[PDB]
């Protein structure tokens, strides 16, 4: 029994359905987005656009439909949600309770998305009084939303609309004027298509736009009319009827757009226009994907969008009930969205399907244009040819980040700080990119200025104390200093007074306008009136460290010699009488900033070579005298007296931490170790409060926060300095340096998630590998339906010739501007073509900087699949690059052509590729697995074993018992894991004495395998298409030495439906000094981990917590939770995480009911659930 | 018997076969992320995938016997 | 809580479940159902499979009450064992040339089919195509 405990770290960020409205009840307006199972509410900012996330809630089910409405006269919008099980819910918001109040449920059908069970398509009436649910079969139900005088929602009985053998493409109800309500549907019959032996009813059968009628008085649903369409139809808008504009639907379809009211209405058609100078196949049409009714009291205009990123401002024209013109006019070109919303005061929320999410502010209203408007009234047989064009109306307010779809994640360290980074190659088309993920606190980037040299320490200190703006930026090199001034156009300044030919070791403000620098030849007291009080160093000694204050200057030379200065009420210096010398040199000291109440601070924590921190008073009564010394485990580098009652901290010579309260006797401590690189305690300002930005391997931060302690890192790579900052660019920031940079950073956040940086790419990256030796990356990039660079080039020039061929003065040229701009494929879409077209690009990239190393481009119809940098046995110590290629994948129906394998030599410290040879193979290669100094290739159905020859590969060994088809392959150093596409994993042992491949173990349970990552010699941690993580252990009864597929088997230990698709498993340790964790990333952009336990007592504790938490608190959308994870398989031996972590969210009387039901206090329960995350994952609390 | 998909002592392989096709495609439409899989796999848009599925609802497995 | 107390019940259910009498088959089959519902998601299957192999040949029996208890028995074995192993012990004589065994295997197949059809999607056996029609769902066969 090895039970597992799910958990999550980054929620799925893929938008699929965005409706909006007023759920606060107020004038303000909020957007219900919907993720895969994570419902989420947002709020834009009407002043700077930052979308501040407010509520997020799991529903543990499948969100299949999502429509808002509002009853007559109400001001609080609701939400309807359709479930996977045959029960519909209605929600409601609570602005103070901060949760979703359920209202009512109805039971009408079975569970699971069947055919005849409704829940698929959801129709609401625009008056809120009726609502309709409808499957893709006979069962269509209509409800009536009556409100009584008790301010609730008295729902009614279900209304039967059974009808044998029909389909439904789409259902949206009709804006009728206070009548028996009308519901539209694009039906399709097929009972004609079920008897013909010749089978011509697959043709000659088209949609009817049947309308449905409720009868309130007589309590039955009757059908209104039925009229045949012409061409097949995707989605439909309801035209706003009532007293403003006519009542109809306008059917978008294959290349046309068609109004069709019922009545005596004649039906306009108008075709969808095409771009100037297409680069496509003219076989493919163009349809729409989304629609956005902008209902205003005075008028309305639509904004719908094509495939290729084109928003159309359809300005409808009509009569009182007749229709006159559907004239068209484009709005602009943005990236692709799947649903989007328009917000008042002109906000547009472009919600992409892939990658980032956008938010546009409408800068120019109305129709102010020079490109001509189109119409349906024009005679044309030729379609309208319009211009593509840059961004002209809209402006991009903010770029909301997302990560979906995460394809191939690897967890590894490719830098010099402790934490393993997350390299994720994810994207879609030419918008794809490579993203570096880290996990520390939200470091806000402010300024970048790269300089030659090595800055060590750079302060930002005021000139005068009254200012909320600082004065200078002091970039101290090794051989000089760079002095900068904040004139908001920051350049090198001269009249600062410093003039640092020597490096600056501290910057402090002693006088009211007197700045003090610390340099190895002395101390230069610099009043704002340019007077120089230069202190000289006696002898050839150098100053090492110092301890500054607003009235005290404590320094330390070589020899442990303390020289104390004093600020007068006049503002000048007086040297203290006794220079207290030490037995060891001073490695670090600490003196606080003075409080405004007292005139001086007492303590002086002095770290030495003697490894004994010493407490020294600086009062005039006991100044420079011993108080208490205390030995230390290592040699510190810095010390900092900080606040949030007196505090001190001690950083060791590795990235570990201890604590020390500031006192004549020390009492409190909690240690934290998350280090191998020494700690630098530098002063910061966290929202009006001081903390210690400890700089180690990472830039760590321990802070008291109302005595809620946290050891917290920064979400950025290695740094070496910090201080405060205040300017017009950033009134509260952090000045940070590293090797060969100069940056301004900032910290503003209390919460903790991943924070990232991204690298641009070209195609959709299938897979990449690490170079071991030089530590570089090998990206392979592959698209279906694409043109490569050369075919794009000579295609454009050939089409230019084809525009010289048009037989006419050829008295002027379009080519002079037409050969100028290649549109950036980042934003201007992509020239998609073909059915068997392919492309391929292979790239090397360095993750420290941004730049690329080598580029290879390939054949048109030959696209790269796999790669493994491997050394071979019988050759030298040199790595290669292998690439498999397939040929002409007519993918549906599957018919392929062949394969080839390249070989690149990987020279120049892995920084330049070169071709060596090429070999043929009759079928698609899908496997490059290095193995015992040779490479393995599993091709098609026949598993093979190759080796390098000087002109080709030299086939040695080959299996053919493998039944269907071979997808992937992974090997422990002896045994071989075969990833069969229908059957489960197949264990293969190879005879080295005989050259023979042997299958000895199998499964009876066919799983649609994608990926795997192994843990030991006997357990295989697989995945699935649909979302079933599975692990199968080999029994120790399996005879290793042998000669349905096998009588012996391998038994399941785990089956756990996730609900999304998992792509790259990797067991690792996320935090330093931690434990094992089997990380699953998933397709929708999320990250999930897995957990091993300690004891059956802990496990049955959590199990009883499940036993009571399920029925004593049901899920939100009414999904039977055990029947949700138990969807395909019976679940075996997993404890869910997020179900059992709603104790932080339930009602306090039920906290009493459950916590006292198990006889345990809620601080004990919540502390127990703190312990798991602080143990394994990214939790930050400091004991 | 009145439920759709009930077999009996005369139902043939074409009937059972086209039934498991039709509820297969209804299941494909029924999920929410396998469409994102097919849209990432071959390069399309999701509405194109939905429309191709709904058009291949009445086509596939062709004409019957005889 | 009777999950650790099933093992000694199994040979007890062997002399019970062996072919003696109507009350044994009927009530003991109801015990198969109730046990099968008590253990649901609780870490026990192979015992129940060893039950299942003794359950299965009892199907061809003429009395309607005891075949009814066989039906609900197979419904409990459906919900605990899973749909896969039910269907794998189902597909044998679906097309057998005899109406008597066909009424049987179709009837069990309908009682499988109404309950949780949506789970059957992955567990369909793939059948390769003839000349006239396409039988391969390539949707289950796309490769990245
Ligand atoms: K030392």
- φ/ψ (deg, to 5) at A745: -125, 175
The encoded tokens of residue A838 equal 């392919």
**Rounded to the nearest whole angstrom, what is the distance from the C-alpha of residue A667 to the centroid of ligand 1?**
24
State the residue for tokens 């600490």.
A590
Q: Which helix or strand (DSSP H or E) is residue A780 part of?
A: strand A777-784
DSSP structure string for A399-467: EE----SEEEEEEE--SSSSSPEEEEEE--GGG-EEEEEE-SB-EEEEEE---SS---B-----SSTT-
Q: Which residues contact A173 (CB under 8 A, 6 or more apart)?
A: A123, A124, A125, A126, A130, A132, A181, A182, A183, A184, A238
How far is Cα A18 from Cα A1086, in angstroms, rounded to an integer? 20
Cβ contacts of A893 on chain C, cutoff 8 Å: 134, 136, 138
Subunits touching B (CB < 8 Å, at least 3 pairs)? A, C
**Rounded to the nearest whole angstrom, what is the distance from the C-alpha of residue A565 to the centroid of ligand 1?**
27
The encoded tokens of residue A1088 equal 């999930």
How far is Cα A981 from Cα A278, in angstroms, rounded to an integer? 40
State the residue for tokens 């090595």.
A454
Length in residues, chain B: 66
How far is Cα A107 from Cα A85, in angstroms, rounded to an integer? 9
Helices and strands, number each (H, E), in chain C: 6, 0
Q: Are A208 and A227 in contact (CB under 8 A)?
A: yes
SS3 A1073: coil
Pick from B30, B45, B58: which is nearest to A289 by CB? B45
Strands A883-887 and A862-867: antiparallel
Helices (H), A829-903: none
Q: A1025 and B34: CB-CB below 8 Å?
A: yes
Q: What is the dihedral of CA A17, A20, A23, A29, to 10 degrees?
A: 140
Which among A569, A661, A563 is positioned nearest to A618, based on CA atoms?
A563
The encoded tokens of residue A976 equal 């071989």
Q: What is the dihedral of CA A707, A708, A714, A719, to 10 degrees?
A: 20
Q: Edge-to-edge strands of the sheet including A755-760?
A: A406-412, A421-426, A433-438, A755-760
What angle (nearest 5°) sits at the alpha carbon of residue A554, between those of residues A549 and A556?
A: 145
How far is Cα B6 from Cα B16, in angstroms, rounded to an integer? 9
Q: Are A212 and A221 in contact (CB under 8 A)?
A: yes
Q: Are A91 and A105 in contact (CB under 8 A)?
A: no
Length in residues, chain A: 1183
CA-to-CA dists, residue A266 to A209, A255, A318, A1133, angstroms: 15, 19, 11, 64
Which among A1004, A1173, A1159, A1007 is positioned nearest to A1074, based on CA atoms?
A1173
Q: Are A419 and A698 in contact (CB under 8 A)?
A: yes
SS3 A793: helix
Q: Which helix or strand (DSSP H or E) is residue A1102 part of?
A: helix A1096-1112
Q: Are B25 and B57 in contact (CB under 8 A)?
A: yes
Q: Are A1134 and A1080 in contact (CB under 8 A)?
A: no
Q: Are A340 and A351 in contact (CB under 8 A)?
A: yes
- The β-bridge partners of A1022 are none
State the residue for tokens 């926060």.
A705
Strands A304-305 and A300-302: unpaired
Dump strand ranges (E) for A272-329.
Answer: 274-275, 293-295, 300-302, 304-305, 311-312, 315-318, 323-327
Residues belonging to chain B with any Cβ–Cβ distance to chain C shorter than 8 Å: 3, 5-9, 11, 13, 17, 20-21, 23-24, 27-28, 30, 37-38, 40-42, 60-63
Q: Edge-to-edge strands of the sheet including A883-887?
A: A862-867, A883-887, A898-901, A919-921
State the residue for tokens 């000669």.
A1043
* DSSP code for C56: G
Q: Do domains A4-396 and A443-758 have the same CATH topology?
A: yes
How far is Cα A860 from Cα A863, in angstroms, rounded to an integer? 8
Q: Angle, nearest 10°, between helix axes C64-81 and C22-38?
A: 20
CA-to-CA dists, residue A87 to A17, A108, A1147, angstroms: 20, 6, 25
Q: C119 and A891: CB-CB below 8 Å?
A: no
**Rounded to the nearest whole angstrom, what is the distance from the C-alpha of residue A681 to the centroid of ligand 1?**
18
C49 inside 8 A of chain A by CB: no
Preceding amide of A678 cis, omega within 30: no
DSSP structure string for A28-60: --EEEEE-SSEEEE----TTT------EEEE-S
Q: Are A838 and A791 in contact (CB under 8 A)?
A: no
How far is Cα C141 from Cα C138, in angstroms, rounded to an integer? 5
Resolution in angstroms comes to 4.0
C-alpha count within 13 angstroms, C-beta hemisphere, residue A721 = 27
Q: Are A766 and A838 in contact (CB under 8 A)?
A: no
C-alpha count within 13 angstroms, C-beta hemisphere, residue B64 = 14
- φ/ψ (deg, to 5) at C37: -95, -30
* DSSP code for A825: T
Closest residue in C to A866 (Cα) is C144
- The β-bridge partners of A711 are A702
SS3 A1008: coil
The encoded tokens of residue A214 equal 């409720």
The encoded tokens of residue C129 equal 């195509």
Q: Which residues contact A94 (CB under 8 A, 6 or more apart)?
A: A100, A101
Q: Are A948 and A872 in contact (CB under 8 A)?
A: yes
How far is Cα A270 from Cα A258, in angstroms, rounded to an integer? 7
Pick from A198, A832, A1060: which is nearest to B43 by CB? A832
* DSSP code for A345: T
Residue A558 buriedness (CB in 10 A; 0-12 / 13-18 / 19+): middle
Q: What is the dihedral of CA A430, A431, A433, A439, to 10 degrees?
A: -170
Q: Which helix or strand (DSSP H or E) is residue B16 part of?
A: helix B13-30
Strands A65-67 and A79-82: antiparallel
Chain A to chain B Cβ contacts (< 8 Å): 99
* DSSP code for A979: E
Q: Are A353 and A314 in contact (CB under 8 A)?
A: no
| Residue A590 neighbours by CB distance under 10 Å | 24
Q: Which residues contact A847 (CB under 8 A, 6 or more apart)?
A: A414, A415, A423, A436, A759, A776, A777
How far is Cα A594 from Cα A547, in angstroms, rounded to an integer? 12
* DSSP code for C118: G
Q: Which helix or strand (DSSP H or E) is residue A991 part of?
A: strand A985-991
The encoded tokens of residue C32 equal 């198969």
C-alpha count within 13 angstroms, C-beta hemisphere, residue A954 = 7
State the residue for tokens 């230019």.
A800
The encoded tokens of residue A1135 equal 């404890």
The encoded tokens of residue A1138 equal 């997020």
Q: Which residues contact A873 (CB under 8 A, 6 or more apart)?
A: A932, A933, A934, A947
The encoded tokens of residue B3 equal 């439920």
Q: Are A637 and A678 in contact (CB under 8 A)?
A: yes
C-alpha count within 13 angstroms, C-beta hemisphere, residue A978 = 32
How far is Cα A894 from Cα A482, in angstroms, rounded to an integer? 66
Subunits touching C (CB < 8 Å, at least 3 pairs)? A, B
Strands A274-275 and A385-386: parallel
Which among A1008, A1021, B21, A37 is positioned nearest to C144, based on CA atoms?
A1008
State the residue for tokens 């194109």.
B48
The domain ranges of chain B are: 1-66
CATH H-level, domain A443-758: superfamily: YVTN repeat-like/Quinoprotein amine dehydrogenase (2.130.10.10)
CA-to-CA dists, residue A785 to A334, A781, A834, A864, angstroms: 21, 13, 6, 14
Pick from A115, A235, A336: which is nearest to B23 by CB? A115
Write a three-state SS string for A642-667. ECCCCEEEEECCCCEEEEEECCCCCC
Q: A899: left (phi > 0), else alpha (psi -120 to 50), else beta?
A: beta
Best residue of A62, A113, A206 to probe chain B, by most B CBs closer than 10 Å: A113
How far is Cα A112 from Cα A84, in angstroms, rounded to an integer? 5
Q: Are A461 and A509 in contact (CB under 8 A)?
A: yes
| Residue C71 neighbours by CB distance under 10 Å | 15
How far is Cα A210 from Cα A168, in angstroms, rounded to an integer? 10
- The β-bridge partners of A925 are A939
- The β-bridge partners of A1139 are none
State the residue for tokens 């009777």.
C2
The encoded tokens of residue A540 equal 């050839």
Cβ contacts of C104 on chain B, cutoff 8 Å: none
Q: What is the dihedral of CA A571, A575, A581, A586, to 10 degrees?
A: 20
CA-to-CA dists, residue A467 to A463, A726, A727, angstroms: 8, 10, 10
The encoded tokens of residue A706 equal 């109302």
State the residue for tokens 């039971």.
A107
Preceding amide of A844 cis, omega within 30: no
- The β-bridge partners of A710 are A703, A1181
How far is Cα A670 from Cα A660, in angstroms, rounded to an integer? 9
- The β-bridge partners of A362 are A394
How far is Cα A1059 from Cα A1064, in angstroms, rounded to an integer? 16
Closest residue in C to B18 (Cα) is C135
How far is Cα A784 from Cα B40, in angstroms, rounded to an integer? 10
Answer yes or no: CATH 2.130.10.10 is held by domain A4-396: yes
How far is Cα A126 from Cα A184, in angstroms, rounded to an integer? 13
Q: Are A550 and A600 in contact (CB under 8 A)?
A: no
């Amino acid at each position: 029994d090895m039970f597992l405990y799910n958990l999550t770290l980054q929620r799925a960020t893929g938008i699929s359905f965005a409706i909006h409205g007023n759920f606060s009840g107020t004038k303000q307006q909020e957007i219900v987005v919907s993720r895969g199972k994570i419902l989420e509410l947002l709020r834009p900012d009407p002043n700077t656009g930052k979308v501040h996330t407010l509520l997020t809630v799991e529903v543990f089910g499948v969100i299949r439909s999502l429509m808002a409405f509002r009853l007559t006269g109400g001001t609080k919008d609701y939400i309807v949600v359709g479930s996977d099980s045959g029960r519909i819910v209605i929600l409601e918001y609570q602005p103070s309770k901060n949760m979703f109040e359920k209202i009512h449920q109805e039971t009408f059908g079975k569970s699971g998305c069947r055919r005849i069970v409704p829940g698929q398509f959801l129709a609401v009436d625009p008056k809120g009084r009726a609502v309709m649910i409808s499957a893709i079969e006979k069962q269509k139900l209509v409800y009536i939303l009556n409100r009584d005088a008790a301010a609730r929602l008295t729902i009614s009985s279900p209304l039967e609309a059974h009808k044998a053998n029909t389909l439904v493409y789409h259902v949206v109800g009709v804006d009728v004027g206070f009548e028996n309500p009308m519901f539209a549907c694009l039906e399709m019959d097929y009972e004609e298509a079920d008897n013909d032996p010749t089978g011509e009813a697959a043709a000659n059968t088209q949609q009817t736009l049947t309308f449905y009628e409720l009868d309130l008085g007589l309590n039955h649903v009757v059908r209104k009319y039925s009229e045949p369409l012409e061409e097949h139809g995707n989605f439909l808008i309801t035209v706003p009827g009532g007293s403003d504009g006519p009542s109809g639907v306008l059917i978008c379809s294959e290349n046309y757009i068609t109004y069709k009211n019922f009545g005596d209405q004649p039906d306009i058609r108008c075709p969808i226009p095409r771009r100037r100078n297409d680069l496509d196949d003219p076989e493919r049409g163009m349809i729409f994907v989304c629609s956005a009714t902008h209902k205003t009291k005075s008028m309305f205009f639509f904004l719908a969008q094509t495939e290729q990123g084109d928003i159309f401002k359809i300005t409808l024209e009509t009569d009182e009930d007749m229709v006159t013109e559907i004239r068209l006019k484009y709005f602009d070109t943005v990236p692709v969205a799947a649903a989007m919303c328009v917000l008042k005061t002109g906000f547009l929320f472009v919600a992409s399907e892939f990658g980032n999410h956008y938010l546009y502010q409408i800068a120019h209203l109305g129709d102010d244009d020079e490109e001509p408007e189109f119409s349906s009234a024009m005679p044309l047989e030729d379609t309208f040819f319009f211009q593509p064009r840059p961004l002209k109306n809209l402006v991009l307010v903010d770029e909301l980040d997302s990560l979906s779809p995460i394809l191939f994640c690897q967890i590894a360290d490719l830098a010099n700080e402790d934490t393993p980074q997350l390299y994720v190659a994810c994207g879609r088309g030419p918008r794809s990119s490579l993203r570096v993920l880290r996990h520390g606190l939200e470091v806000s980037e402010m300024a970048v200025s790269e300089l030659p040299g090595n800055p060590n320490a750079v302060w930002t200190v005021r000139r005068h104390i009254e200012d909320e703006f600082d004065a200078y930026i002091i970039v101290s090199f090794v051989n000089a200093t760079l002095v900068l001034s904040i004139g908001e156009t920051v350049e090198e300044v001269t009249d600062s007074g410093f003039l640092g030919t020597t490096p600056t070791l501290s910057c402090s403000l002693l006088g009211d306008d007197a700045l003090v620098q610390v340099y190895p030849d002395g101390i230069r007291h610099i009043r704002a009136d340019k007077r120089v009080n230069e202190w000289k160093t006696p002898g050839k000694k150098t100053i090492v460290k110092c301890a500054v204050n607003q009235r005290q200057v404590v320094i330390a030379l070589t020899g442990g010699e303390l020289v104390y200065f004093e600020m007068d009420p006049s503002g000048q210096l007086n040297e203290y009488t006794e220079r207290k010398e030490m037995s060891a040199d001073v490695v670090c000291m600490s003196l606080a900033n003075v409080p405004p109440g007292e005139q001086r601070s007492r303590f002086l924590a002095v770290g030495l070579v003697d490894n004994t921190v010493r407490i020294i008073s600086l009062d005039p009564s006991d100044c420079l005298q011993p108080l208490s010394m205390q030995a230390l485990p290592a040699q510190p580098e810095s010390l900092c007296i900080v606040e949030m009652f007196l505090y001190l901290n001690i950083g060791l010579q590795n990235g570990v931490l201890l604590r020390t309260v500031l006192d004549p006797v020390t009492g409190d401590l909690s240690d934290t170790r998350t280090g191998s690189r020494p700690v630098k305690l530098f002063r910061v300002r966290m929202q009006g409060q001081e903390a210690v930005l400890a700089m180690s391997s990472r830039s760590w931060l321990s802070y008291s926060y109302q005595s809620r302690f946290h050891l917290t890192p920064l979400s950025y790579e290695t740094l070496e300095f910090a201080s405060g900052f205040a300017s017009e660019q950033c009134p509260e920031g952090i000045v940070a340096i590293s090797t060969n940079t100069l940056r301004i950073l900032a910290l503003e956040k209390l919460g903790a998630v991943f924070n990232q940086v991204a690298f641009p790419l070209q195609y959709t990256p299938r897979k990449f590998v690490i170079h071991p030796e030089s530590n570089n990356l090998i990206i392979i990039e592959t698209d279906h339906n694409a043109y490569t660079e050369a075919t794009k080039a000579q295609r454009k020039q050939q089409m230019a010739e084809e525009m010289v061929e048009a037989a006419g003065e050829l008295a002027a040229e379009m080519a002079a501007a037409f050969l100028n701009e290649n549109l950036p494929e980042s934003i201007f879409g992509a020239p998609k073509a073909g059915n068997g077209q392919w492309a391929s690009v292979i790239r090397v990239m360095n993750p420290i900087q941004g730049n690329t190393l080598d580029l290879v481009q390939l054949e048109q119809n030959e696209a790269a699949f796999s790669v493994a940098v491997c050394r071979f046995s019988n050759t030298g110590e040199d790595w290669y690059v292998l690439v498999g290629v397939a040929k002409d994948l007519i993918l549906n129906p599957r018919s392929v052509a062949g394969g080839f394998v390249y070989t690149y030599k990987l020279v120049n410290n892995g920084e330049k590729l070169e071709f060596l040879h090429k070999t043929p193979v009759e079928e698609v290669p899908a496997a490059i697995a290095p193995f015992q100094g040779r490479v393995l290739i599993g091709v098609g159905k026949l598993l093979r074993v190759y080796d390098l020859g000087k002109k080709k590969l030299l086939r040695k060994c080959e299996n053919k018992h493998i039944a269907n088809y071979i997808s992937g392959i992974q090997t422990i150093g002896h045994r071989v894991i075969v990833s069969d596409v229908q059957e489960s994993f197949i264990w293969v042992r190879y005879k080295r004495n005989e050259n023979q491949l042997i299958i000895f173990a199998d499964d009876t349970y066919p799983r649609w395998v994608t990926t795997a990552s192994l843990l030991d010699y006997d357990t295989v941690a697989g995945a699935d298409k649909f979302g079933n993580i599975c692990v199968v252990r080999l029994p120790p009864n399996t005879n290793d030495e042998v000669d349905n597929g096998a009588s012996q088997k391998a038994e399941v230990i785990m089956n756990y439906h996730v609900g999304e698709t998992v792509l790259s498993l990797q067991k690792t340790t996320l935090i330093p000094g931690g434990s094992e964790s089997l990380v699953y990333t998933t397709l929708s952009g999320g990250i999930g981990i897995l957990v091993p336990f300690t004891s059956h007592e802990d496990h049955d504790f959590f199990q009883h917590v499940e036993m009571h938490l399920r029925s004593e608190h049901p899920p939100l959308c009414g999904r039977d939770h055990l029947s949700f994870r138990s969807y395909y398989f019976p679940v075996k031996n997993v404890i869910d995480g997020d179900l059992c972590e709603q104790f932080n969210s339930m009602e306090p009387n039920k906290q009493k009911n459950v916590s006292e039901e198990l006889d345990r206090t809620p601080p004990e329960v919540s502390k127990k659930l703190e312990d798991i995350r602080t143990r394994y994952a990214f939790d930050y609390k400091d004991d | 018997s009145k439920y759709i998909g009930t077999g009996h002592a005369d139902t043939t392989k074409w009937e059972w076969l086209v039934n498991q096709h039709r509820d297969s495609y209804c299941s494909y439409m029924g999920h929410f992320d396998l469409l994102n899989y097919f849209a990432i796999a071959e390069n399309e848009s999701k509405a194109r995938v939905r429309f191709n599925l709904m058009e291949k609802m009445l086509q596939p497995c062709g004409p019957p016997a005889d | 809580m009777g999950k650790d107390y099933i093992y000694a019940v199994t040979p007890l259910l062997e002399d019970a479940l062996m072919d003696r009498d109507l009350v044994h088959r009927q009530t003991a089959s109801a015990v198969v159902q109730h046990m099968s519902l008590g253990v649901y998601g609780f870490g026990c299957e192979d015992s129940l499979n060893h039950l299942l192999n003794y359950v299965w040949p009892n199907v061809f029996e003429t009395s309607p009450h005891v075949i009814q208890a066989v039906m609900g028995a197979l419904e409990g074995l459906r919900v605990a064992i899973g749909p896969c192993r039910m269907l794998q012990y189902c597909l044998q004589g679906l097309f057998h040339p005899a109406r008597k065994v066909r009424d049987v295997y179709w009837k069990i197949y309908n009682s499988i089919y109404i309950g949780s059809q949506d789970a059957l999607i992955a567990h369909y056996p793939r059948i390769y195509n003839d000349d006239k029609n396409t039988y391969i769902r390539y949707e289950l066969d796309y490769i990245l």
